[PDB]
Amino acid sequence: SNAMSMAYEEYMRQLVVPMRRELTGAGFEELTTAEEVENFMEKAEGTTLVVVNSVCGCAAGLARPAATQAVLQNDKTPDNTVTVFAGQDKEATAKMREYFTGAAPSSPSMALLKGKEVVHFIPRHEIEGHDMEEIMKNLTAAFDAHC
Amino acid sequence: MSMAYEEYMRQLVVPMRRELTGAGFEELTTAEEVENFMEKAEGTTLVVVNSVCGCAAGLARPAATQAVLQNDKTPDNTVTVFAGQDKEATAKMREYFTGAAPSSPSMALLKGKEVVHFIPRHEIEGHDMEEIMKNLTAAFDAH
Amino acid sequence: SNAMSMAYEEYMRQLVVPMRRELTGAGFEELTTAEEVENFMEKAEGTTLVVVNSVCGCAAGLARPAATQAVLQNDKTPDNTVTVFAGQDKEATAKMREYFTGAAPSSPSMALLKGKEVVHFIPRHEIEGHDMEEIMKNLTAAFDAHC
Amino acid sequence: SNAMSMAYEEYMRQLVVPMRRELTGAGFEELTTAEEVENFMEKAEGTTLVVVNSVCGCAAGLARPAATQAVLQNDKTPDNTVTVFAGQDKEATAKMREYFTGAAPSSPSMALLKGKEVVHFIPRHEIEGHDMEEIMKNLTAAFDAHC
């Protein structure tokens, strides 16, 4: 029944909070709603780092840390930073992904935008199995190319 | 977070509770309730010390419930304390088992508030349904 | 439809099996769909005792035993004995409850019928907090009046 | 195996998922099998935090949060973060516990490893009866000392 299900979602909701704050406390704006995604993307100017967040280990161990560090450490940096949480905010991420023309869905993943156009994409396979150094070098070389 | 968690376990253990209440076992959830029941209790009583493990699920609970339901002679009372979930209720009841070591799941047959037969985890763990049943039913037949 | 809810459903389905068999063991036909229920009530003739079964402790300790002991220890007895399982076969007990206009929904509960019209009702509050004696006294009396 | 045993195991399996995700969404690798433990401990290098997880309020309120906070707030941290789930992955934790020479079994509990040698150990009695501040100091002091 829904009672157990309500409880399960609330519990997963609570455990997911630090997984959000990890990005949001670093200045990444949460887009938790398909409308919020449209709002941002239809107005976005200059460069944007989009992080498609996720609960899995490699989001925790590689993607989130790499994204927040690249942004804080690099001379050249995106004008905006935002995130959608795959698997948790489904409509938000499905809406964001509509803008990633050409890309398949994956999680975690990252896009560098100019306006609402992708100019650099980092799919899950470019993240999983690699180490921080590689991934941050990936991001920063992209920041330097585009930001 | 604390709320969500305790709430989480409170919801998810409901079914493990229902298995016993759905068999007519009365749930004693506080030390107070335990003391109240044991002081009033008359005749025989099966106490099931419940727990959230697999042998409770696949052995003890099914064994206890079938026994009382299908045996000709049965306890006048059927009650349960939930080990680990209702901690204080459990500790209190365990005090009436002067001779028994603590384990869960475990089961006790009482006459009044005196233990007359005891089934420790080790007589449940590593045994099968029927085996545990006969242990109970023989107890019922004797007391 | 996810794994947690599938698993909850499977578990509750098995949980409930023993509570079903106490009644079916005593001749009570299970009505598990709205259609089975609908089907039964139409060709129904004579008197029917309907037991609305429940996962609750008073169903176990009082309702089911009283119902089975009652149908056996009485010269006057219903022609039909059927059951629905509240909370588990939701559409089944909601369908049956429509033939119970005048009675409030509760569980366990029991109803006596002549044909398709209810002529006696035993709510949970006439079960919960009562003795096996008064309950089947309630039952048997009703049998005498109608069966 | 029957329907009940099968449904129950699957039910418990799904319900501990959040208590797995709390650690895996913090970077901890899961060792769910005896073979996975040996494979790891046998080839392990550098330092390792092992978390003996379990299903209980102590694990939920102290052990898991403390372990994840310490690992991400502290400058020195283990090279590896791993976990065995006591009570759920029984062969896995029994196997891990064989590596803890002369330590007593308890859950939750944590071990700091240098290679496969237990370099510091926190039993349940260090966790239960304390607050985060205390456990964290215990953890990070261990890290400061070995890594």
**The 3-state secondary structure of chain A, one letter per residue:** CHHHHHHHHHHHHHHHHHHHHHHHCCCCEECCCHHHHHHHHHHCCCEEEEEEECCCHHHHHHHHHHHHHHHHHCCCCCCEEEEEECCCCHHHHHHHHCCCCCCCCCCCEEEEEECCEEEEEECHHHCCCCCHHHHHHHHHHHHHHHC
B64 shares its domain with B17: no
A59 contacts in chain D (CB < 8 Å) = 25
Cβ contact (<8 Å) for B54 and D15? no
Rg (CA), chain D: 15
**Are the beta carbons of B29 and B82 closer than 8 angstroms?**
yes
D84 shares its domain with D15: no
> Diameter of chain D by CA atoms?
51
Header resolution in angstroms? 2.3
Breaks (C-N over 2.5 A) in chain D follow: none
Cβ contact (<8 Å) for B57 and D4? yes
The single-letter DSSP state of residue B58 is: I
A61 CA to chain D: closest CA distance, Å? 5
Amino acid at B110: L
D61 shares its domain with D101: yes
Q: Strand A29-30 to strand A80-85: parallel, antiparallel, or no bridges (unpaired)?
A: parallel
Residues of chain A with a CB closer than 8 angstroms to some CB in chain C: 1, 4-5, 8
C12 contacts in chain B (CB < 8 Å) = 15
Cβ contact (<8 Å) for C55 and B23? no
A11 shares its domain with A49: no
Q: Strand A109-114 to strand A117-122: parallel, antiparallel, or no bridges (unpaired)?
A: antiparallel
Residue C63: closest C-alpha in chain B:
B24
**Are the beta carbons of D121 and D109 closer than 8 angstroms?**
yes
Number of H helices, E strands in chain B: 7, 5
D14 shares its domain with D37: no
Please, what's the b/e burial string for A13-27 (b: 16 or more CB within 10 A of its CB; e: otherwise)? ebbbebbbebbeebe
Token reading at A50: 């989009």
Closest residue by Cα to residue A49 from A72, A76, A83, A26: A83
**Are the beta carbons of A94 and A35 closer than 8 angstroms?**
no
Phi-psi group of C46: left, alpha or beta (phi > 0 → left; psi -120 to 50 → alpha; rest → beta): left
What number of C-beta contacts closer than 8 Å exist between C and D?
A: 28
D18 contacts in chain A (CB < 8 Å) = 8, 11-12, 15
The structural domain count of chain B equals: 2
Token reading at D77: 């941290």
Which among D16, D19, D55, D58 is annotated as catalytic?
D58
Q: What angle do CA C124, C126, C128 make, to 5 degrees?
A: 60
Token reading at A88: 């948790």
Token reading at A4: 């157990």
- Selecting from D7, D15, D17 the residue whose C-beta is nearest the C-beta of C10 gives D7
How is the beta sheet containing D109-114 ordered, strand by strand? D29-30, D80-85, D47-53, D109-114, D117-122
Q: What angle do CA A129, A134, A136 make, to 5 degrees?
A: 115
Q: What is the DSSP string of D36-92?
A: HHHHHHHH--SEEEEEEE-SSHHIIIIIHHHHHHHHHH-SS--SEEEEEETTTSHHH
Q: What angle do CA A71, A72, A75 make, to 5 degrees?
A: 80
A57 CA to chain D: closest CA distance, Å? 5
Which pairs from C92-100 meet CB under 8 Å and 24+ separation? C92/C31, C92/C32, C92/C33, C92/C34, C92/C36, C92/C37, C93/C52, C94/C34, C95/C33, C95/C34, C95/C37, C95/C38, C96/C31, C96/C37, C96/C41, C96/C50, C96/C52, C97/C52, C99/C41
Cβ contact (<8 Å) for D15 and C3? no
A22 shares its domain with A66: no
How far is it, in rounded angstroms, from Cα A92 to Cα A67? Answer: 20
Token reading at D107: 């859950």
Q: Bridge partners of A110? A: A51, A122
Q: What is the DSSP string of C17-62?
A: HHHHHHHHTTT-EE--SHHHHHHHHHS--SEEEEEEE-SSHHIIII
CATH number of the domain that residue C23 is part of:
6.10.250.2150
- Selecting from B5, B54, B84 the residue whose C-beta is nearest the C-beta of D8 gives B54
Cβ contact (<8 Å) for D11 and C13? no
Alpha-carbon torsion angle A131, A129, A23, A107, nearest 10: 160
> Is C58 a residue of the active site?
yes
Cβ neighbours of D74 (radius 10 Å): 17
Cβ contact (<8 Å) for A7 and B12? yes
Alpha-carbon torsion angle D13, B12, D4, D16, nearest 10: 10
A4 CA to chain C: closest CA distance, Å? 8
Q: Give me the phi and psi of B79, to 5 degrees please.
A: -140, 165
Using CA atoms, how far residue C61 sits from B1, B37, B76, C65, in Å, is 38, 17, 11, 7
Alpha-carbon torsion (D72, D50, D133, A18), positive or negative: positive
D48 shares its domain with D120: yes
Give 3-state DSSP helix, strand, coil % of chain C, rounded to 5.
50, 20, 30
Q: Which domain holds residue B56?
A: 25-143
D80 shares its domain with D33: yes
Q: Helix, strand, or coil here: C93?
A: helix
Q: Is C104 exposed, middle or buried (0-12, 13-18, 19+ CB in 10 A)?
A: exposed
Token reading at D131: 């607050």
How far is it, in rounded angstroms, from Cα C7 to Cα B10? Answer: 17
A93 shares its domain with A130: yes
A45 shares its domain with A18: no
Q: How many CA atoms lie within 13 A of B57 on its CB side?
A: 23
C21 shares its domain with C56: no
Using CA atoms, how far residue D79 sits from A134, C77, C143, D71, D100, in Å, is 18, 76, 77, 10, 19
A33 shares its domain with A23: no
**Method by which the model was determined:** X-ray
Cβ contact (<8 Å) for C7 and D13? yes
C30 CA to chain D: closest CA distance, Å? 20
Q: Bridge partners of C76? A: none
CATH number of the domain that residue B89 is part of:
3.40.30.10
A57 contacts in chain D (CB < 8 Å) = 24-25, 27-29
Cα D112–chain centre separation: 10
> Is A147 a residue of the active site?
no
